[PDB]
Symmetry: D2
Subunit: 134 residues, 4 copies
């Protein structure tokens, strides 16, 4: 259940918290791992997913050594696009002292599926549709 990410030096900035764009990387890993875990890449012989839009809110900033949990759900799945909701919670600190998980970031992201050359909108592959549903 879910994906867990450790916050490393590479993820932090001079303020001592995770650099804002890195939360998007964590969300991306979560999405791709769903495919990797079914032994496939999130792309196929004549199509690829393309991000259309993101809505993101920032909550308590994460910091070095914390373990973050990325929670993913399908908001909406159509023939031509999918919208995902992803939330990130800090679930552990580096000291492994007891803590109530706290929200760090949330996003809603819309993806289309397109041909590589043309970049024209095509249907999400049936196999990927099934995987998303699950």
């Amino acid at each position: 259940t879910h994906m867990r990410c450790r916050v490393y030096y590479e993820d932090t900035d001079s303020e001592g918290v995770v650099y804002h764009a890195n939360y998007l990387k964590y969300c991306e890993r979560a999405r791709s791992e769903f495919f990797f875990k079914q032994n496939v890449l999130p792309e196929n012989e004549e199509g690829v997913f393309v991000i259309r839009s993101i809505k993101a809110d920032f909550f308590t900033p994460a910091s070095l050594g914390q373990v973050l949990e990325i929670r993913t759900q399908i908001k909406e799945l159509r023939k031509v696009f999918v919208v995902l909701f992803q939330e990130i919670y800090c679930i552990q600190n580096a000291s492994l002292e007891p803590m109530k998980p706290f929200k760090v970031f949330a996003s809603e992201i819309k993806f289309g599926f397109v041909n590589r050359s043309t970049y024209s909108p095509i249907a999400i592959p049936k196999l990927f549709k099934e995987l998303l549903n699950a």
Copy 2:
């Protein structure tokens, strides 16, 4: 407002800019606004904090292209500022003429807070004055 080149570090296996990197180009344009006016976008006890982002992705840019990031102030209040930024591709590395095209747009809201407490304070006079000009 600011121009930057797409380098290998910026691209992914699909041959276009990895999506999150557009947020980096936008951040550079925000910070350079301050840097070129000889200040850091932070001070003694306080920093800007991002509250929310709304971003739209359009035609992807790729290796060696020159991008132009245009930044405008959508809203400026005592305690927050909302910026709208758009990125256009304006040149190929090869130089073949091309009509510039939109690549990305974002609307981002920033607060200003005390570092230690994250308590919201007014955007400091220094930065407010700069943002007014």
Copy 3:
């Protein structure tokens, strides 16, 4: 040993891991050694500072592959430590069987510095005892 997956963020337009990212992987492996034991690789008075890196690049890794970072203490002195790290690809996303292959190796020298001054001091007892194992 620590394992990492190659994600889109790690790849470049040639479909392989962008070269500098291998250093990030090695860093993760070093930090996890401390994280495992419920501490940060830094304390109240000091931080580790990289002095030098010798790195070699072998067969490139690609999207979805699993890499294993192997770390050994080449040399441990009062004031510095030299770590040798190798990265091997051990799995495909598809789980198609494969002989592991070397991707990257680095030898890095770290000193420990009294923060402010950045002046070199002995590695602390806690890290010393850990680093020995």
Copy 4:
């Protein structure tokens, strides 16, 4: 010489440039040489591949500083090139006076290879003369 600004994306929790980022700066400087001659550093069946890096780290750079990347050819063969690249910090964002200081120095070897095979091939004539210049 290429100049690069230190942005938040470049810094870590210790307030200095994350170590691997210096390799990115050196890469930009290399690719820009090619982009300026209106070419990408690759052609129809060949790419440059990094084989090895030797690097030393000196005084760290921080937020807002301007870094200058100086590049020279240490060795050019038909098969491979070794470049020496040094990074100096030359200014603060604030323009508070400072004597430029060395931040990073690397020697990097590159081969030119087939994509399909990764078998080495002669550096292209156009690229060989670019490199020599």
